[PDB]
């Protein structure tokens, strides 16, 4: 409703770096808000794409950002009559970023990994890796839970069970308020998908550089399955956390699996031991239900509510015709221990191929009326097809069915404006929470400041 669309703030990275693919707010030890922006195709040392992370200080005029430097050198360790190898070329560092306390987690989902033992090998595969930085101190650490040292023949002899070679850990990420990092790995267990969790503090204290294969004892991974419904489901394409079982001492995990059960798509709510509590099945095949998930309480009863994006949903129109527009589903958590029910609201896109629902960002309370609100992206929507961000206001019964405000893309065609969203933080310290929108196709981030309601 009250985001200012006139005086925007633009930050920009290098050309072709895909600056703005991911972003998040970051507060330092003194509570000063910055923006952390991932750029997954920034050039490395050998003039090859490796990705990179930028830490932008808040300035109303915007501009360029300093780099949050990570090591981009390939690594080799000859130990235990084996050879460990990490390949950071086209690893995509900055394809997801997330902030917790004064720590930044940047992940490279396509970092490759191989183990050589004479004439055998593990196979060079994208296990993924994440990089952790404490900018104020300079501390650095890595976390790569899917790295193994098992040779390729063993997997064949055991029918490819527990095969974490193509995890792509860091594809999606989130951090519980207690400080547990949860990584989505859609390719784990031969493209079923897995989750990996470990406390940030234990990632830092158990990491030493050059070890390449180290244990993190407090870490916890999900489990393989023989159920065909999970095959090629990409369990972990999107991840989120929330409170869904009534017990406040437990944190629950929300996991998107947009090709679950032969591209039906699904979202599951689990406990921290990855035991399943509820499962939201998709509505239409290939709609990519579960592409994006969001957790926030919209109706103000203190019970977290769930949102799920299906950006390829095809709306039925006259003359038996279908129109890919994208759809968002709202599920309101009921009172006490009961399953989540049918959707309380359906939001369907307007523009053909607009991909409404590609990103869903909680805004906090934007108009300060007592109900939390959200922003939904349609990165190829709008009457010009340049991109649109739609704001929906919370209310006692759920969400309003019509948007209160629409942000049209200030960038040219192909910018993918809205592909990444993040709200619910007040960056200019005016009492109202603000919204940052990424446009990786234009290598830019736009900051929308909320202002008092007119």
């Amino acid at each position: 409703l009250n985001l200012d669309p006139v005086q925007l703030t633009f930050y920009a990275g290098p050309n072709g770096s895909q600056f703005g693919f991911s972003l998040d707010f970051h507060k330092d030890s003194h509570g000063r808000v910055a923006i952390v922006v991932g750029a997954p195709r920034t050039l490395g040392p050998s003039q090859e794409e490796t990705g990179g992370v930028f830490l932008c200080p808040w300035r109303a005029e915007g501009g360029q950002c300093p780099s949050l430097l990570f090591d981009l050198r390939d690594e080799t360790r000859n130990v235990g009559s084996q050879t460990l190898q990490t390949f950071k070329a086209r690893q995509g560092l900055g394809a997801s970023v997330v902030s917790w306390s004064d720590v930044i987690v940047a992940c490279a989902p396509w970092q490759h990994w191989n183990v050589l033992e004479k004439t055998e090998e593990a196979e060079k595969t994208p296990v993924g890796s994440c990089f952790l930085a404490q900018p104020e101190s300079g501390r650095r650490a890595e976390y790569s839970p899917c790295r193994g040292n098992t040779l390729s023949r063993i997997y064949v002899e055991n029918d490819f069970s527990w095969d974490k070679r193509y995890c792509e850990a860091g594809f999606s990420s989130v951090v519980t308020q207690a400080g547990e990092l949860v990584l989505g790995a859609p390719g784990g267990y031969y493209f079923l998908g897995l989750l990996a969790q470990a406390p940030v503090a234990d990632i830092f204290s158990s990491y030493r550089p050059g070890i390449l294969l180290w244990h993190v004892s407090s870490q916890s991974l999900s489990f393989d399955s023989s159920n065909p419904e999970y095959f090629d489901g990409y369990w972990g394409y999107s991840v989120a956390v929330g409170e869904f079982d009534g017990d406040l001492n437990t944190t629950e995990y929300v996991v998107g699996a947009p090709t679950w059960s032969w591209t039906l798509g699904a979202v599951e709510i689990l406990d921290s031991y990855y035991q399943r509590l509820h499962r939201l099945r998709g509505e239409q095949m290939a709609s990519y239900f579960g592409h994006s998930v969001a957790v926030t309480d919209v109706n103000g009863d203190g019970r977290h509510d769930l949102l799920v994006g299906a950006p390829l949903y095809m709306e039925s129109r006259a003359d038996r015709k279908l129109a890919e527009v994208g759809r968002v589903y709202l599920f309101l958590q009921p009172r006490g221990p009961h399953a989540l029910g049918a959707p309380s609201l359906l939001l369907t896109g307007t523009q053909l191929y607009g991909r409404f629902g590609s990103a869903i960002a909680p805004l906090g309370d934007l108009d300060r009326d007592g109900y939390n609100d959200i922003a939904v992206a349609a990165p190829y929507g709008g009457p010009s097809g340049r991109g649109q961000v739609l704001v929906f206001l919370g209310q006692s019964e759920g969400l309003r069915s019509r948007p209160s405000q629409v942000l049209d893309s200030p960038f040219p065609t192909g910018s993918a404006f809205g592909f990444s969203l993040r709200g619910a933080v007040d960056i200019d310290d005016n009492g109202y929470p603000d919204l940052i929108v990424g446009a990786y196709g234009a290598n830019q981030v736009a900051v929308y400041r909320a202002q008092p309601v007119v």
Partner: antibody
Amino acid sequence: EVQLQQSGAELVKPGASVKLSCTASGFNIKDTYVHWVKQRPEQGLEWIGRIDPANGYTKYDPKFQGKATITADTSSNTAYLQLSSLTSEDTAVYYCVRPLYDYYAMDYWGQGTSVTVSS
Amino acid sequence: DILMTQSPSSMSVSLGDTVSITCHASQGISSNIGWLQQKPGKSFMGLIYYGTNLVDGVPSRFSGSGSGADYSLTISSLDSEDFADYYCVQYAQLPYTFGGGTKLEIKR
């Protein structure tokens, strides 16, 4: 806390067999490799072999192929070292080891099991 | 197999001294070396892993250094508890091999 609680000292005859145990305390035996090391006063420390209790695959120093047989039962969270056709020279103290962080290191040691071979 | 030549066999030193044990391998092992401690009539304790890294709980007076095929454990200011046996172990290759051993004995 991590602790490795081994079996009590064994007293056995030459030609017989003995199966030492190494029980994990405060953690899952499935987490890391588990190694076995043999200590003698003159000869010193010798590496017997290792097992990954997550799958059961083992490695051995060729010197010990035949005598030593390393096994692991995830259930009771215990690893085993089985010695066969015992001899005077098998009289030694046997430790089980696991690494702290590094996959390939030797950082946490059990108290040691004393084996004596004699008629 | 890789040969771990550990010197000296023993040394008689006093409290507060700064001493240094060395270890030399038959080939390069690129810091893949560990340092152990065996207090008299007791089991083993890990001191170092991967050349220089301290095992959790070990006092900072211990320190590992070295490279290629020559490494050095060092104790700054000996404590009464530090008088024990010390071994190096390589894990650059299977089979793992140990050093001969080094006893720290009280000087008088």
